[PDB]
Design a protein around this ligand. Structure first.
Ligand SMILES: [Mg+2]
Ligand SMILES: [Mg+2]
Ligand SMILES: [Mg+2]
Ligand SMILES: [Mg+2]
Ligand SMILES: [Mg+2]
Ligand SMILES: [Mg+2]
Ligand SMILES: [Mg+2]
Ligand SMILES: [Mg+2]
Ligand SMILES: [Mg+2]
Ligand SMILES: [Mg+2]
Ligand SMILES: [Mg+2]
Ligand SMILES: [Mg+2]
Ligand SMILES: [Mg+2]
Ligand SMILES: [Mg+2]
Ligand SMILES: [Mg+2]
Ligand SMILES: [Mg+2]
Ligand SMILES: [Zn+2]
Lengths: 152, 115, 108
RNA sequence: UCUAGAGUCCAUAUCAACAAUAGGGUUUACUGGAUCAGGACAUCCCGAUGGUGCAGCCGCUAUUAAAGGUUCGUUUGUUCAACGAUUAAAGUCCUCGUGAUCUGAGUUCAGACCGGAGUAAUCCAGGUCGGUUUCUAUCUACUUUAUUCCUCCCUGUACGAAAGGACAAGAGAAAUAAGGCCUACUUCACAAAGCGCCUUCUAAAUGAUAUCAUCUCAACUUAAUACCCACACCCACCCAAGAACAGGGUU
RNA sequence: UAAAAGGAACUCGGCAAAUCUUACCCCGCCUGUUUACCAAAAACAUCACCUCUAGCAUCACCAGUAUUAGAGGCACCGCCUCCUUAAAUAGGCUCCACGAGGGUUCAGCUGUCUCUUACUUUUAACCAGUGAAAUUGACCUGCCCGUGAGGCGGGCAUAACACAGCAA
RNA sequence: CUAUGUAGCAAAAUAGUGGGAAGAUUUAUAGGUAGAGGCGACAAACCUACCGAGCCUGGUGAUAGCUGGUUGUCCAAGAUAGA
RNA sequence: CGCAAUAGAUAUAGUACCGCAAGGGAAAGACAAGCAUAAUAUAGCAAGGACUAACCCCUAUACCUUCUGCAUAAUGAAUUAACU
């Protein structure tokens, strides 16, 4: 039975789980885009979001500083968190990271995933667009837009 | 949960009990179909190498909400025909003995304090 | 325990070729409508993703060559500029990572 | 089965001696326990009925009844027996029932000691201490078919020779079993659980063979619903659904 | 790893675990040695004591000589040649010290148990790679009753097929 | 002593709990004792994984009143006193 | 009226490899079974009588060896090829 347990089980125990997610999160803050196994990235996305939330409070706060000290291992990144990432998202109140699935890994055929922090300098991921607005179904729906707007 | 093989401290001034003895009183039987005994369930005790009927008047096991949860498994010695052997009780006894039927009227006429 | 009798080729064929053990035909493949390569719906075009990772790696090699050694995460944003692209009016005060090939058409 | 002998009178209220008719074994001298239990009734309890010498609950025997239940411990292990406390009860047997589910004692493994027999080696259907049986499931089969007790009214009527003391009908309280839940307590903490909570449905009347009579292997007349239930999808994500597959949701 | 109340009611036995105390009894004096791979012991050895044999050269005893050497028995030393439990088939020549020896008891402790529960790790189930072995007459491999049992007889049942369990 | 493991990591291990740990201790190195023999704080203990008597070659194709086997077609006669 | 690559020497070799050692001691070179093409459909020693028809109907207690006969009471055999 596992009803209502939101935390995956990975590594050699709870502690190794936190440490694995910590290394993933450090790599993400250092490079702003990493390809990792899908389940691990899905577990780490929440932590990266809340890390940006803690980083918005700013250097002066001590709780946020302790948290970013634990969750960043090469400390050169703590400046970045408080001076490049958190400032970058002064407008967005949520959803700072985008997560996609990518071709499975060559060796062990695992389910992969690229995760990145929105707005970085890197070449943009090939996001999937929706169908062009000029397609047949969209045109008929646009006609319905007009005809319903005039009636109402 | 006053079941078989549990130590209970007699609190009734115990004309019989309360005297030194290397053993301590133990419950050897509970007069309920199942073993567990709750308040008012009269049990049997091996005290001073003798067998004597008892009556539970408090236990460390949490009960319902509005009834007391003592910290010692308290018992009153009662004679076979229901008469309490002692003549006094000092430790508080719960007011949850005026409830569900049993030989409890005498045991309240002999105590002095409630909770 | 151990088997009491060999199992015949007939029983083994009714097990091995049962549908539950067959490989299912995938109903979710298609063609990248613009790029024109195969892809699953919920996954990135493999060829496009590879051509993106190549450029990301080249950019990162330049970044490493400029930062010198480890422990040098800058405290400012970064912008990457290809040949014949002066730093725009918005990118002053941001580190520049020069590259020596024409900007890819897919890089916006 | 004959009652024949008894029983303060009297075989039938009880033993019922011999025998007869029935079902069943007797091998030594000249295999338990845990786990799960399937089944019979020759019934321990609960249920229904007859007689009683029970004038009455209970007792006694007799018929019927196998849906349900049939406790925990001290000493010990040819497996029983004794003893304490209870209980409505602690039933008699078949399938050690069950060791590719687990354990112990043994009886028969090498070590050693004590007692008996022997010149000795050694024996002993003796007593002690110690002591290793491994298994990845191929096939079959299978994996979602409410009782009891106590208390109280009804009261101490009938029954009853005094004395004691009923049914039918209800109302509370507890446990157990099945099924389910997490508001509180408890172990814990997006949840799973119990020590907690909730629900459980053979005596008569008429009457012939035999005109009275006679309960009739005479005719003839009387003493479970509930639950499930939408033909045609399945890429992706989530899930109180889940081993995979399935199932619920994506407004 | 954690655990409500109870704390040995488990069990052959407090084995395991948690906690740290006490008292006695049997055997053996003690440290030691032993059945490499089921027995570590109450067996062997052991100081102490006793008995038997032996008057002596250059390869052991021994470059030794009766207070010596070899072979045996025994095992220092001193002393002689009714209670327990509620209940009980269990426990209760002197002789300190010691024992992973055997039996019993007090107190504590605890998931041993009343009565199980949660979480973690490995295993596990699925995807991908590599890939055994015992076993195997053939099998198109059902149930009940009888005979003497998947296969015979008489009844019953019965569309095919994976996957995970269980152990009649 | 318990649990895991039982084609196992291992033809006797692993984890914990344990006995000894200045001695009759433990141990590296070369030599010696050789099979009815050696050695043995006797357990029939050990002498290269299997010792109430090593291992290899030879006599040896040991012997076996015991077990197991014994190969084309077709026909015909064919069975239970006893010493 | 000797063998022709499981024979003939053990031999391509006393090599490889096993053993501390004595010692042991190989293999080989020039459309059989198993599968795929093509999974299965009530029922049962898997066949026979048949039938228009594959199944359906009726009949039908595997083989060797050992015990007086053995329902498989027990022993032996996964199966092909070569040698026996
Ligand atoms: Mg893992
Ligand atoms: Mg719990
Ligand atoms: Mg506890
Ligand atoms: Mg010792
Ligand atoms: Mg010892
Ligand atoms: Mg696989
Ligand atoms: Mg049968
Ligand atoms: Mg299966
Ligand atoms: Mg011969
Ligand atoms: Mg003979
Ligand atoms: Mg003939
Ligand atoms: Mg040859
Ligand atoms: Mg040859
Ligand atoms: Mg072929
Ligand atoms: Mg058979
Ligand atoms: Mg065989
Ligand atoms: Zn594309």
């Amino acid at each position: 039975i596992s009803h209502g347990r939101v935390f995956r089980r990975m590594g050699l125990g709870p502690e190794s789980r936190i440490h694995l997610l910590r290394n993933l999160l450090t790599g993400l803050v250092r490079h702003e885009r990493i390809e990792a196994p899908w389940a691990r990235v899905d577990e780490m996305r929440g932590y990266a979001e809340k890390l940006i939330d803690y980083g918005k409070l700013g250097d002066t706060n001590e709780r946020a500083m302790r948290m970013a000290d634990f969750w960043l291992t090469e400390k050169d990144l703590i400046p970045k968190l408080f001076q490049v990432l958190a400032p970058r998202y002064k407008d967005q109140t949520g959803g700072y990271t985008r997560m996609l699935q990518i071709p499975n890994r060559s060796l062990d055929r695992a389910k992969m995933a690229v995760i990145e922090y929105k707005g970085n300098c890197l070449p943009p991921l090939p996001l999937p667009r929706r169908d062009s607005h000029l397609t047949l179904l969209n045109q008929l729906l646009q006609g319905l837009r007009q005809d319903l707007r005039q009636s109402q | 949960a006053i079941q078989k093989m549990t130590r209970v401290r007699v609190v009734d001034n115990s004309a019989l009990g309360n005297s030194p003895y290397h053993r301590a009183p133990r419950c050897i039987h509970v007069y309920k179909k199942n073993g567990v005994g709750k308040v008012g369930d009269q049990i049997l005790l091996a005290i001073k190498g003798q067998k004597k009927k008892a009556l539970i008047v408090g236990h460390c096991m949490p009960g319902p909400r509005m009834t007391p949860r003592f910290d010692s498994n308290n018992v009153v010695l009662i004679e076979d025909n229901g008469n309490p052997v002692g003549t006094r009780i000092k430790t508080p006894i719960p007011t949850s003995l005026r409830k569900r039927e049993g030989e409890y009227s005498k045991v309240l006429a002999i105590a002095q304090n409630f909770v | 325990a151990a088997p009491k009798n060999r199992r015949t080729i007939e029983v083994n064929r009714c097990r091995r070729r049962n549908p539950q053990k067959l490989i299912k035909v995938k109903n979710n493949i298609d063609v990248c409508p613009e790029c024109g390569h195969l892809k699953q719906k919920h996954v990135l075009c493999a060829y496009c993703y590879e051509k993106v990772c190549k450029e990301t790696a080249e950019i990162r090699r330049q970044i490493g060559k400029q930062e010198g050694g480890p422990f040098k995460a800058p405290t400012i944003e970064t912008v990457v500029l290809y040949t014949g692209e002066t730093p725009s009016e918005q990118d002053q005060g941001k580190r520049i990572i020069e590259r020596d090939r024409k900007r890819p058409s897919w890089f916006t």
